[PDB]
Amino acid sequence: GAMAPSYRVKRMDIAKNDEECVVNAANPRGLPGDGVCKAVYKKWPESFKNSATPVGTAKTVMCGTYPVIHAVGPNFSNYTESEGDRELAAAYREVAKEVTRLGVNSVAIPLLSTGVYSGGKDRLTQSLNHLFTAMDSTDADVVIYCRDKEWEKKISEAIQMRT
Ligand SMILES: O=C1CC[C@@H](NC(=O)c2cscn2)CN1
Ligand SMILES: [Cl-]
Ligand SMILES: [Cl-]
């Protein structure tokens, strides 16, 4: 574990992370996809061998010795708000189990279901609070990756609020 486990946020491409493993915002079919998923496919294509997994789950595939945790959040275009909320919380609980099992000291993580799976809604707070619920009991350093300047400020504020 990390000596003083922390949360941080950075505004940059998660494919350039400085952590011991990465969480992909995956589709259920293990396809190259779009957005974060397509950046992950370009950087770690070997990690897409048998990476298909259902919604609300995480499946880890090694690229060399570098772990890629494929986490499948719900597409809110297809799920009800209620069922989507349940699957989004579940995906993050499976990420926490994988990060623990791998014994890593740090993990790079995007906000699940906030891009093309958002159903056209702002889900920063919903997704970030499910991330905290799952990751708070882990001792890995967590580095959250985003692309938007206003999202960086809001994520940073939420981290600092808890202290
Ligand atoms: O800061 C943000 C902006 C909206 C969403 N990002 C992407 O859609 C996206 C596409 S490629 C990388 N992120 C989540 N985070
Ligand atoms: Cl960048
Ligand atoms: Cl998404």
CSV table of C-alpha atoms and ligand atoms in Angstrom, one decimal:
chain,number,residue,atom,x,y,z
A,1,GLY,CA,0.0,0.0,0.0
A,2,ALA,CA,0.9,3.7,-0.2
A,3,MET,CA,2.5,5.2,3.1
A,4,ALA,CA,-0.2,7.9,3.2
A,5,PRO,CA,-2.9,6.9,0.7
A,6,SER,CA,-4.2,10.0,-1.2
A,7,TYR,CA,-6.6,11.1,-4.0
A,8,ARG,CA,-5.4,13.4,-6.7
A,9,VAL,CA,-6.8,14.7,-10.0
A,10,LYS,CA,-5.0,15.6,-13.2
A,11,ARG,CA,-6.3,17.0,-16.5
A,12,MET,CA,-4.5,15.0,-19.2
A,13,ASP,CA,-4.7,11.8,-21.2
A,14,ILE,CA,-4.9,8.7,-18.9
A,15,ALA,CA,-2.7,6.9,-21.5
A,16,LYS,CA,0.3,9.1,-20.2
A,17,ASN,CA,-0.4,8.2,-16.5
A,18,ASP,CA,2.4,7.8,-13.8
A,19,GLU,CA,0.6,5.1,-11.8
A,20,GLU,CA,1.3,1.3,-11.5
A,21,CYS,CA,-2.0,0.3,-13.3
A,22,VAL,CA,-4.8,1.9,-15.3
A,23,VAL,CA,-8.6,1.5,-15.3
A,24,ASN,CA,-10.1,1.5,-18.8
A,25,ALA,CA,-13.7,2.9,-19.3
A,26,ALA,CA,-14.4,-0.2,-21.3
A,27,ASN,CA,-17.4,-1.4,-23.4
A,28,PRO,CA,-18.8,-4.9,-22.6
A,29,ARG,CA,-17.5,-6.4,-25.9
A,30,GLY,CA,-13.7,-5.6,-25.5
A,31,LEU,CA,-13.9,-3.3,-28.7
A,32,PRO,CA,-11.5,-0.4,-29.3
A,33,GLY,CA,-14.4,2.0,-28.7
A,34,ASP,CA,-14.1,5.8,-28.5
A,35,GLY,CA,-12.8,8.4,-26.0
A,36,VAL,CA,-10.7,7.0,-23.0
A,37,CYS,CA,-11.3,3.4,-24.3
A,38,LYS,CA,-9.7,4.2,-27.8
A,39,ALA,CA,-6.7,6.0,-26.1
A,40,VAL,CA,-6.2,2.9,-23.9
A,41,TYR,CA,-6.5,0.6,-27.0
A,42,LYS,CA,-3.8,2.7,-28.8
A,43,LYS,CA,-1.4,2.6,-25.8
A,44,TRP,CA,-2.1,-1.1,-24.5
A,45,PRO,CA,-3.7,-3.0,-27.4
A,46,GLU,CA,-2.4,-6.3,-26.1
A,47,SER,CA,-4.7,-5.8,-23.0
A,48,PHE,CA,-7.8,-6.3,-25.2
A,49,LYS,CA,-7.2,-10.1,-25.5
A,50,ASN,CA,-10.4,-11.6,-24.0
A,51,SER,CA,-11.2,-8.4,-22.2
A,52,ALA,CA,-15.1,-8.6,-22.9
A,53,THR,CA,-17.0,-8.6,-19.6
A,54,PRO,CA,-20.6,-7.7,-18.5
A,55,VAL,CA,-21.9,-4.3,-17.4
A,56,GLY,CA,-21.1,-3.6,-13.7
A,57,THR,CA,-17.9,-5.8,-13.7
A,58,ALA,CA,-14.1,-5.3,-14.1
A,59,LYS,CA,-11.7,-7.7,-15.9
A,60,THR,CA,-7.9,-7.2,-15.7
A,61,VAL,CA,-5.6,-8.1,-18.7
A,62,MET,CA,-1.8,-7.6,-18.5
A,63,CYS,CA,0.0,-5.6,-21.2
A,64,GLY,CA,3.5,-7.0,-20.5
A,65,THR,CA,3.5,-6.7,-16.7
A,66,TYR,CA,1.4,-3.5,-16.7
A,67,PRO,CA,-2.3,-4.2,-15.5
A,68,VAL,CA,-5.2,-2.8,-17.5
A,69,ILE,CA,-8.5,-3.1,-15.4
A,70,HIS,CA,-11.4,-3.0,-18.0
A,71,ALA,CA,-14.3,-1.5,-16.0
A,72,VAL,CA,-17.7,-1.6,-17.7
A,73,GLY,CA,-20.0,1.2,-16.6
A,74,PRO,CA,-23.7,1.3,-17.8
A,75,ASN,CA,-24.7,3.3,-20.8
A,76,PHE,CA,-27.5,5.6,-19.3
A,77,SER,CA,-29.1,5.7,-22.8
A,78,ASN,CA,-30.2,2.0,-22.2
A,79,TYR,CA,-30.5,1.7,-18.4
A,80,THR,CA,-33.1,3.4,-16.1
A,81,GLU,CA,-31.6,6.0,-13.7
A,82,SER,CA,-32.2,3.5,-10.9
A,83,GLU,CA,-30.6,0.4,-12.5
A,84,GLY,CA,-27.8,2.5,-14.1
A,85,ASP,CA,-27.0,3.9,-10.7
A,86,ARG,CA,-26.8,0.3,-9.3
A,87,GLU,CA,-24.5,-1.0,-12.1
A,88,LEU,CA,-22.2,2.1,-11.9
A,89,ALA,CA,-21.7,1.6,-8.1
A,90,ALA,CA,-21.0,-2.1,-8.8
A,91,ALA,CA,-18.4,-1.5,-11.6
A,92,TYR,CA,-16.4,0.6,-9.1
A,93,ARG,CA,-16.7,-2.0,-6.3
A,94,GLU,CA,-15.1,-4.5,-8.8
A,95,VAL,CA,-12.3,-2.0,-9.6
A,96,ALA,CA,-11.5,-1.8,-5.8
A,97,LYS,CA,-11.3,-5.7,-5.6
A,98,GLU,CA,-8.9,-5.8,-8.6
A,99,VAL,CA,-6.7,-3.0,-7.4
A,100,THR,CA,-6.5,-4.8,-4.0
A,101,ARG,CA,-5.8,-8.3,-5.6
A,102,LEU,CA,-3.0,-6.8,-7.8
A,103,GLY,CA,-1.2,-5.4,-4.7
A,104,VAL,CA,-0.4,-2.1,-6.6
A,105,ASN,CA,0.5,1.1,-4.7
A,106,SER,CA,-1.2,3.5,-7.2
A,107,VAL,CA,-4.0,3.4,-9.9
A,108,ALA,CA,-5.0,5.8,-12.7
A,109,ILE,CA,-8.9,6.0,-13.0
A,110,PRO,CA,-11.3,7.8,-15.2
A,111,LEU,CA,-14.9,8.8,-14.1
A,112,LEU,CA,-17.0,5.9,-15.4
A,113,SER,CA,-20.3,6.6,-17.4
A,114,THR,CA,-19.5,10.4,-17.7
A,115,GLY,CA,-18.7,10.5,-21.5
A,116,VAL,CA,-20.8,8.9,-24.3
A,117,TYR,CA,-22.4,6.5,-21.7
A,118,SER,CA,-23.8,9.5,-19.7
A,119,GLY,CA,-27.1,9.6,-21.6
A,120,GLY,CA,-26.4,13.4,-22.2
A,121,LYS,CA,-26.4,14.2,-18.4
A,122,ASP,CA,-23.7,15.7,-16.1
A,123,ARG,CA,-22.8,12.7,-13.9
A,124,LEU,CA,-19.5,14.1,-12.3
A,125,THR,CA,-20.8,14.0,-8.7
A,126,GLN,CA,-22.7,10.7,-9.1
A,127,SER,CA,-19.7,8.9,-10.7
A,128,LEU,CA,-17.1,10.5,-8.3
A,129,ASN,CA,-19.1,9.6,-5.2
A,130,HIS,CA,-19.4,5.9,-6.3
A,131,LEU,CA,-15.6,6.0,-6.9
A,132,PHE,CA,-15.0,7.2,-3.4
A,133,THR,CA,-17.5,4.6,-1.9
A,134,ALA,CA,-15.5,1.8,-3.5
A,135,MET,CA,-11.9,3.2,-3.2
A,136,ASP,CA,-12.0,4.7,0.4
A,137,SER,CA,-11.2,1.3,2.0
A,138,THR,CA,-8.2,0.6,-0.4
A,139,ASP,CA,-4.7,1.9,0.4
A,140,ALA,CA,-3.6,2.6,-3.2
A,141,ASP,CA,-2.8,6.2,-4.2
A,142,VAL,CA,-5.7,7.1,-6.6
A,143,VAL,CA,-5.1,9.5,-9.5
A,144,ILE,CA,-8.3,10.6,-11.3
A,145,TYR,CA,-7.9,11.7,-15.0
A,146,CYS,CA,-10.2,14.2,-16.7
A,147,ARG,CA,-10.0,16.3,-19.8
A,148,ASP,CA,-12.2,19.4,-19.0
A,149,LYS,CA,-10.9,22.5,-17.0
A,150,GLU,CA,-14.2,23.0,-15.1
A,151,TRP,CA,-14.3,19.2,-14.2
A,152,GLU,CA,-10.7,19.4,-12.8
A,153,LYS,CA,-11.7,22.3,-10.5
A,154,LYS,CA,-14.9,20.4,-9.3
A,155,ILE,CA,-13.1,17.1,-8.7
A,156,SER,CA,-10.3,18.9,-6.9
A,157,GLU,CA,-12.8,20.7,-4.7
A,158,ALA,CA,-14.6,17.4,-3.8
A,159,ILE,CA,-11.2,15.8,-2.9
A,160,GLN,CA,-10.2,18.8,-0.7
A,161,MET,CA,-13.7,19.0,1.0
A,162,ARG,CA,-13.1,15.6,2.8
A,163,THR,CA,-9.7,17.2,3.6
B,1,LIG,O1,-13.4,16.1,-17.9
B,1,LIG,C1,-14.2,15.4,-18.4
B,1,LIG,C2,-15.1,15.8,-19.6
B,1,LIG,C3,-16.2,14.9,-20.0
B,1,LIG,C4,-15.8,13.5,-19.9
B,1,LIG,N1,-14.6,13.2,-20.8
B,1,LIG,C5,-14.8,12.6,-22.0
B,1,LIG,O2,-15.8,12.5,-22.6
B,1,LIG,C6,-13.5,12.2,-22.5
B,1,LIG,C7,-13.3,11.9,-23.8
B,1,LIG,S1,-11.6,11.5,-24.1
B,1,LIG,C8,-11.3,11.7,-22.4
B,1,LIG,N2,-12.4,12.0,-21.7
B,1,LIG,C9,-15.4,13.2,-18.5
B,1,LIG,N3,-14.3,14.1,-18.0
B,2,CL,CL,-2.4,15.2,-22.6
B,3,CL,CL,-18.4,7.0,-20.8
